[PDB]
Design an enzyme around this catalytic site. Structure first.
Site, PDB file in Angstrom:
ATOM      1  N   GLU A  49     -11.876  22.845  -4.250  1.00 48.77           N
ATOM      2  CA  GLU A  49     -12.912  21.830  -4.484  1.00 48.77           C
ATOM      3  C   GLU A  49     -14.018  21.979  -3.453  1.00 48.77           C
ATOM      4  O   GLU A  49     -15.193  21.876  -3.796  1.00 48.77           O
ATOM      5  CB  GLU A  49     -12.313  20.420  -4.440  1.00 48.77           C
ATOM      6  CG  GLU A  49     -13.354  19.345  -4.694  1.00 48.77           C
ATOM      7  CD  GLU A  49     -12.905  17.951  -4.302  1.00 48.77           C
ATOM      8  OE1 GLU A  49     -12.612  17.731  -3.098  1.00 48.77           O
ATOM      9  OE2 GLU A  49     -12.953  17.059  -5.178  1.00 48.77           O
ATOM     10  N   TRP A  73     -11.001  16.714 -11.332  1.00 49.91           N
ATOM     11  CA  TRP A  73     -12.183  16.105 -11.953  1.00 49.91           C
ATOM     12  C   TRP A  73     -12.127  16.041 -13.484  1.00 49.91           C
ATOM     13  O   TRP A  73     -13.134  15.706 -14.106  1.00 49.91           O
ATOM     14  CB  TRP A  73     -13.463  16.834 -11.495  1.00 49.91           C
ATOM     15  CG  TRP A  73     -13.800  16.623 -10.045  1.00 49.91           C
ATOM     16  CD1 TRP A  73     -13.346  17.354  -8.985  1.00 49.91           C
ATOM     17  CD2 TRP A  73     -14.727  15.674  -9.508  1.00 49.91           C
ATOM     18  NE1 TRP A  73     -13.890  16.880  -7.812  1.00 49.91           N
ATOM     19  CE2 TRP A  73     -14.753  15.859  -8.102  1.00 49.91           C
ATOM     20  CE3 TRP A  73     -15.533  14.675 -10.071  1.00 49.91           C
ATOM     21  CZ2 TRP A  73     -15.559  15.088  -7.255  1.00 49.91           C
ATOM     22  CZ3 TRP A  73     -16.350  13.924  -9.234  1.00 49.91           C
ATOM     23  CH2 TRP A  73     -16.353  14.128  -7.841  1.00 49.91           C
ATOM     24  N   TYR A 121     -21.285  15.350  -5.575  1.00 55.26           N
ATOM     25  CA  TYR A 121     -21.367  15.987  -4.252  1.00 55.26           C
ATOM     26  C   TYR A 121     -22.141  17.294  -4.149  1.00 55.26           C
ATOM     27  O   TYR A 121     -23.058  17.360  -3.352  1.00 55.26           O
ATOM     28  CB  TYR A 121     -19.971  16.231  -3.687  1.00 55.26           C
ATOM     29  CG  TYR A 121     -19.215  14.949  -3.428  1.00 55.26           C
ATOM     30  CD1 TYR A 121     -19.558  14.118  -2.360  1.00 55.26           C
ATOM     31  CD2 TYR A 121     -18.154  14.571  -4.241  1.00 55.26           C
ATOM     32  CE1 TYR A 121     -18.853  12.949  -2.102  1.00 55.26           C
ATOM     33  CE2 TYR A 121     -17.423  13.406  -3.981  1.00 55.26           C
ATOM     34  CZ  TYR A 121     -17.795  12.594  -2.916  1.00 55.26           C
ATOM     35  OH  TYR A 121     -17.103  11.445  -2.627  1.00 55.26           O
ATOM     36  N   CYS A 134     -16.812   8.544  -2.912  1.00 58.95           N
ATOM     37  CA  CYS A 134     -16.082   7.764  -1.888  1.00 58.95           C
ATOM     38  C   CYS A 134     -16.592   8.204  -0.526  1.00 58.95           C
ATOM     39  O   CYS A 134     -16.466   7.444   0.418  1.00 58.95           O
ATOM     40  CB  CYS A 134     -14.573   8.002  -1.974  1.00 58.95           C
ATOM     41  SG  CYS A 134     -13.774   7.133  -3.343  1.00 58.95           S
ATOM     42  N   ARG A 161     -16.139   5.029   2.040  1.00 61.07           N
ATOM     43  CA  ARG A 161     -16.234   3.623   1.651  1.00 61.07           C
ATOM     44  C   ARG A 161     -14.956   3.031   1.076  1.00 61.07           C
ATOM     45  O   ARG A 161     -14.767   1.816   1.111  1.00 61.07           O
ATOM     46  CB  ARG A 161     -17.373   3.425   0.638  1.00 61.07           C
ATOM     47  CG  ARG A 161     -17.122   4.218  -0.675  1.00 61.07           C
ATOM     48  CD  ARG A 161     -18.071   3.783  -1.820  1.00 61.07           C
ATOM     49  NE  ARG A 161     -17.714   4.515  -3.038  1.00 61.07           N
ATOM     50  CZ  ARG A 161     -16.707   4.195  -3.847  1.00 61.07           C
ATOM     51  NH1 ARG A 161     -16.043   3.055  -3.678  1.00 61.07           N
ATOM     52  NH2 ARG A 161     -16.379   4.994  -4.857  1.00 61.07           N
ATOM     53  N   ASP A 192      -7.762   5.307  -0.720  1.00 67.39           N
ATOM     54  CA  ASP A 192      -6.414   5.090  -1.263  1.00 67.39           C
ATOM     55  C   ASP A 192      -5.521   5.761  -0.223  1.00 67.39           C
ATOM     56  O   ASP A 192      -5.468   6.977  -0.167  1.00 67.39           O
ATOM     57  CB  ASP A 192      -6.279   5.750  -2.652  1.00 67.39           C
ATOM     58  CG  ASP A 192      -4.866   5.855  -3.209  1.00 67.39           C
ATOM     59  OD1 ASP A 192      -3.912   5.475  -2.498  1.00 67.39           O
ATOM     60  OD2 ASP A 192      -4.721   6.311  -4.357  1.00 67.39           O
TER      61      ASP A 192
HETATM   62  O1  UMP Z   1     -11.686  11.280  -2.519  1.00 63.20           O
HETATM   63  C1  UMP Z   1     -11.296  10.189  -2.941  1.00 63.20           C
HETATM   64  C2  UMP Z   1     -11.600   9.642  -4.231  1.00 63.20           C
HETATM   65  C3  UMP Z   1     -11.053   8.471  -4.601  1.00 63.20           C
HETATM   66  N1  UMP Z   1     -10.193   7.763  -3.780  1.00 63.20           N
HETATM   67  C4  UMP Z   1      -9.600   6.495  -4.226  1.00 63.20           C
HETATM   68  C5  UMP Z   1     -10.162   5.249  -3.551  1.00 63.20           C
HETATM   69  C6  UMP Z   1      -9.970   4.211  -4.649  1.00 63.20           C
HETATM   70  O2  UMP Z   1      -8.590   3.838  -4.723  1.00 63.20           O
HETATM   71  C7  UMP Z   1     -10.344   5.009  -5.894  1.00 63.20           C
HETATM   72  C8  UMP Z   1     -11.825   5.053  -6.194  1.00 63.20           C
HETATM   73  O3  UMP Z   1     -12.160   3.801  -6.824  1.00 63.20           O
HETATM   74  P1  UMP Z   1     -13.462   2.942  -6.379  1.00 63.20           P
HETATM   75  O4  UMP Z   1     -13.408   2.690  -4.897  1.00 63.20           O
HETATM   76  O5  UMP Z   1     -14.694   3.769  -6.747  1.00 63.20           O
HETATM   77  O6  UMP Z   1     -13.329   1.691  -7.207  1.00 63.20           O
HETATM   78  O7  UMP Z   1      -9.873   6.348  -5.625  1.00 63.20           O
HETATM   79  C9  UMP Z   1      -9.852   8.232  -2.524  1.00 63.20           C
HETATM   80  O8  UMP Z   1      -9.065   7.653  -1.785  1.00 63.20           O
HETATM   81  N2  UMP Z   1     -10.446   9.422  -2.167  1.00 63.20           N
END
Ligand code: UMP
Ligand code: UMP
Lengths: 275, 281
Positions: free
Chosen positions: A57, A79, A105, A165, A185, A188
């Site tokens: 990626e 993706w 990105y 994110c 921002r 998970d």
């Molecule tokens: O690189 C990444 C992409 C996504 N997420 C997780 C964060 C959230 O749980 C979800 C994205 O959802 P939103 O914050 O856009 O609602 O996927 C990550 O942790 N890292």
């Protein structure tokens, strides 16, 4: 203390004191620091991280691609769910072809500010090439305090398959070392964060290599740091695990430019994650 | 422990172990958390901060202004050195009139993406009004994880009088409280950081007021956190000072929209700082 304990401690803190929202348990504002020194690569060990996916990626972002089919050709499906013609039609993009993620990105790093048309459009010379700009600044004015690459583009976020994110990253040079800080921002903790650490630690290794610097630290800043409720049992089992020493990463040859890296240039040795 | 100790501890850590590179002494990556709860306002007490300047500059950003003369008319000179016709000519902006800072904070918060012409141009309905967007999201979908306002615009940074230190901020809602995290790429621990904490704590108080929420935390994240070598003696004098309890802040009336605040609407009670310490260039 093993750097992976910062990650485990935050998961423990979130599950024990976080805010339940209808399902996640979250906290706002966190910061971790991972050393990248002496070939140390912070690929988390208490659970196996998808190393092949991290590197492929990242090489695809560096090429400036917004075409998910180029990842699919390499058996990378991260993706996929967001690139189907059905998913793209649901968002409002009707003339958008299969695999076209919009100005995600790759496009922001290489062409920030250019008008996006499609994933096959020649954007040569359009917008700001922030990745080359950061490399030029690190080489020519390393004390600069504006060495930033931003993917959060308010104009383009509505056109993207998913809002990014990873909002921005900043670089810093001292003691012959290159450090990077990422502002994420939304994190998970269970399935996203280990992959995310590896991506930006790898980008730092790549830029350090082409700027004749040594990797320093990766500083990971989080906004909404959360655990999905359905992962709590699995995470309680992972918290019982002791981190194993991190693997080492070596770059096999003298790579001249950031665009010149290939997956085979990376030598990841001693990765021993828990089952 | 008093929240101001996070700030003092970082200054002490930077002077002791920071990287020596006008000379700066720096560290990369820091994070502080200031409670904004129960009317507490984190206006730092180890040196007297320019409260009227914090508030007036913030009201000027909220109006979307990029005209330093509007601050000068209020005896606020924080953007003066960067708005003179001589400084603007040195930067390479020849048709730029006195006071025109270019597409700085006010413009990015209200009109991100719009083409900038001058400080008097009517940008109504042009670009992304990120500040109103943040307010609409907090009211309608508070669990959203994309409540962001970004001032770092790579297209416009070369047109600005100064590149922004405050790159972006993100909001978060839980338990009826509004929190804010600021990503600051460059932080002068002497005179910069106290003012910067107050600005974003005040913005959180204002948005909480207009969204019927209570202020929660202000999370301050720093990139290049530094002190200037010529300020080390002054900072060693500051480190001898014990923080005083923070003042309280109340909003005197029911303010309906974010654009409706006036400086007289703020009631800052019990601010008891130690005197200013000279930290010059
Ligand atoms: O690189 C990444 C992409 C996504 N997420 C997780 C964060 C959230 O749980 C979800 C994205 O959802 P939103 O914050 O856009 O609602 O996927 C990550 O942790 N890292
Ligand atoms: O709100 C602000 C504006 C500026 N600075 C300081 C940080 C740096 O010392 C300098 C800005 O210089 P650069 O980072 O842009 O070089 O001013 C702050 O701390 N806060």
């Amino acid at each position: 203390r093993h750097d992976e304990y910062q990650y485990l401690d935050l998961i423990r803190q979130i599950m024990r004191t976080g805010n339940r929202k209808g399902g996640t348990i979250s906290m706002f504002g966190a910061q971790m620091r991972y050393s990248l020194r002496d070939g140390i690569f912070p690929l988390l060990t208490t659970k196996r991280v998808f190393w092949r996916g991290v590197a492929e990626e990242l090489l695809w972002f560096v090429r400036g691609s917004t075409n998910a089919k180029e990842l699919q050709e390499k058996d990378i499906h991260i993706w996929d769910g967001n690139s189907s013609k059905e998913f793209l039609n649901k968002m409002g993009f009707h003339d958008r072809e299969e695999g076209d993620l919009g100005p995600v990105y790759g496009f922001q790093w290489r062409h920030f500010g250019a008008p996006y048309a499609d994933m096959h459009t020649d954007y040569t010379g359009q917008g700001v090439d922030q990745l080359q700009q950061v490399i030029d600044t690190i080489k020519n004015n390393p004390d600069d305090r504006r060495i930033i690459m931003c993917a959060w583009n308010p104009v383009d976020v509505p056109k993207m398959a998913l809002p990014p994110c990873h909002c921005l990253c900043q670089f810093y040079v001292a003691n012959g070392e290159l450090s990077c800080q990422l502002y994420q921002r939304s994190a998970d903790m269970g399935l996203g964060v280990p992959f995310n650490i590896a991506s930006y630690a790898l980008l730092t290794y790549m830029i350090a290599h082409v700027t004749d610097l040594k990797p320093g630290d990766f500083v990971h800043t989080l906004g909404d740091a959360h655990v999905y409720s359905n992962h709590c049992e699995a995470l309680e089992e992972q918290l019982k695990r002791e981190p194993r020493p991190f693997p080492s990463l070596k770059i096999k040859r003298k790579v001249e430019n950031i665009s010149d890296f290939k997956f085979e240039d990376f030598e990841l040795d001693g990765y021993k994650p828990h089952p």
